[PDB]
Every structure is written in structure tokens, then in C-alpha cells.
Amino acid sequence: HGYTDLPVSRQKVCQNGTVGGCGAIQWEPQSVEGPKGFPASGPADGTICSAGHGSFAALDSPKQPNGQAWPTTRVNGGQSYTFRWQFTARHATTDFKYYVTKPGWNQNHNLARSDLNLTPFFTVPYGGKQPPATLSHSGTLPSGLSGHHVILAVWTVHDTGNAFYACSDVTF
Amino acid sequence: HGYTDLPVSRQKVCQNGTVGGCGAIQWEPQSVEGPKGFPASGPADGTICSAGHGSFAALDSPKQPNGQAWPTTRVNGGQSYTFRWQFTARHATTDFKYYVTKPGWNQNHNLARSDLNLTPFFTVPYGGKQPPATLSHSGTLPSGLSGHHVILAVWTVHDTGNAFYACSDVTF
Ligand SMILES: [Cu+2]
Ligand SMILES: [Cu+2]
Numbered sequence A, B: 001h002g003y004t005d006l007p008v009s010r011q012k013v014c015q016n017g018t019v020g021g022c023g024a025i026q027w028e029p030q031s032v033e034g035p036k037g038f039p040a041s042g043p044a045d046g047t048i049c050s051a052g053h054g055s056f057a058a059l060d061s062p063k064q065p066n067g068q069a070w071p072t073t074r075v076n077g078g079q080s081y082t083f084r085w086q087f088t089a090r091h092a093t094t095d096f097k098y099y100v101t102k103p104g105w106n107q108n109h110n111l112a113r114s115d116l117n118l119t120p121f122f123t124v125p126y127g128g129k130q131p132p133a134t135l136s137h138s139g140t141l142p143s144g145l146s147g148h149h150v151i152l153a154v155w156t157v158h159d160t161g162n163a164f165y166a167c168s169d170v171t172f
């Protein structure tokens, strides 16, 4: 159980007071768990950011619950960046993978595989080890992007069929 | 790292003073480690009880180093028995399997697959968990046997290619 707080994920902006109206997620931003094996398996298109949980469907919407744009973290393409997770349960881990949207992605529907560059821009094989409660690691942000984009962080848990999914809105 | 002390294994009778002349094993009865996947893979025939270690070859001999019979533990066929391991390192574990020799096995050469009933008489799937430093579990001894037999205990370590092998001489 955990989420990304750098770049801050939708579940965390719902918990932290930045976005109102998100429903159940606001009490448990750590809980966005779904099947592993993205993109071949894992949550269905349009339910990626909620990991398939109907109770967390606000996270999949292209807008925050009030219809305004999601808040974004400003980032610089091609620059190193600290990606950070906060965990409430530090499970043995297979890997962390980070994906970005493609130029021209559909910003007006729920995020889907067709919006994403499905080769991760940053991968951390983790060898079955247990992360610290706050894990910070450096990766290089993708180049060639401008404007609103989504970074999808996927944490795959060792000796399970599960992964945690965290969509973060960024501006390149 | 570990060995069986019930029924007492060859490496432990070498360490405990019961059998002299065994070489390096007497200082490290916990160390009889070889490839997993017995019987299809694992130590070669004639090196099973040493797990393939030339330095522990005394364990594979049909006699103790002085040429006398190995000491044996008297057991009753068809009766429940406490099998016990002592560990010096409590690794995450896949399983424990226990095998017995067949009637008419070749008592005059180094133990081989052809001497063994290769369906274990007792198996403990362990789910990747770490055993306690002393693990005792109950299994039913095979029936239909008399005289000198060998019980082979195999401890397979999770997320490795390795297992620990321990041959014990018994009398049915
Ligand atoms: Cu968890
Ligand atoms: Cu494991």
C-alpha cells in the first residue's frame, strides 16, 4: 500500500485537500491496487488511474470532480527528477515502472493505453526487496513533450498478482 | 543452512562425535547445499548425501569413514514421527520433502536415485515463509520396510537455485 507524492498523484491530491469531491479515496490514497502485468494485463482502459475500483472512479476522470482541470506539477523534460513513493505497507517488491503520455494524447476521456507510451521511460528492478517507508529514486524525465501530460507509476508487488497504480498530472 | 537432527543425519553424527574421520563436515554440518530440483536435477548419483561437495564425500560412503556401518536410528514403520531440522540461517523456504530407500536397495555403493522411492513419503509445502530456528513437524513413516534404510531430507530454499540435503540412516 502506497502512492507517489513526487510528482504528486491524483489519489494524493484528493487526500491532501487540494482537490475536493473525490469520494472514498480521500481517506485511503494508499489503496489503488489492481492486477499486475500492465500493459498486457492489469486494469481495463479507462480505469487505469483507479486500478479498476469503481469506488475510486474519480481518479480516472479527465477533470477533477468539479470539472476544472486537475492540478499539475511543472516539470522539465530531459532533466533528472526524484520520484518518490510513500508507503503504508512496505511489501517485497518486483519493480517500479514509470510511463508517460504521448504527444496528442486524448485529454478529454479517461486515460487509456492508447494515450501512453507503453515503453516505460524509467524502470527500477527491485529484486524482491522491501522498500523503505519513503522511497526516493532518480530518473530522467522524457524529452520531446510539452503541455499537460500524465505520468503513470506502477509498483509491482513480489509473489502476488497485484500492483499499485498512481497517475500524476504534469506540465512539460 | 541447516540439517536434520531427527532422524539424525550423517552430517550431524559426524559433528556430534558419534562418528570419527569425516573431514571438513565435522565443523559445519549445516553446509550440505546443492542444486535444487531433485530428483530430475540436483546432485549427481553417488553424491546425493554430500550435495555434490567433494570436501563432504565421507557422507556419501555406504559406511562410516572407519569402515563400520553407519549408526542408525530405530524407527517404526507406519507410525507418526517428529522430523526436526536445526537451522543456522533461516531462509525463506519453498518446501521440505522426505524420501526413503526401497526394499532391496544397494547398501554397498554410494546412495543413488535407483535406491530411492522417488515419490516422497512426506512433503511440507512452506509458502515462502521463514522457518523457526528449530522446526519440528509430524509425518507418517513409510510402511512395508525392514532393516537398514536411508531417509533423505531435502530443504528447498525460496528464490534460489539451492536445496539442503541430509541423509539419515534408520532401521525399520
Ligand atoms: Cu499493501
Ligand atoms: Cu519470493
Ligand SMILES: [Cu+2]
Pocket (backbone or CB within 6 Å): B001, B002, B089, B091
Ligand atoms: Cu543457508
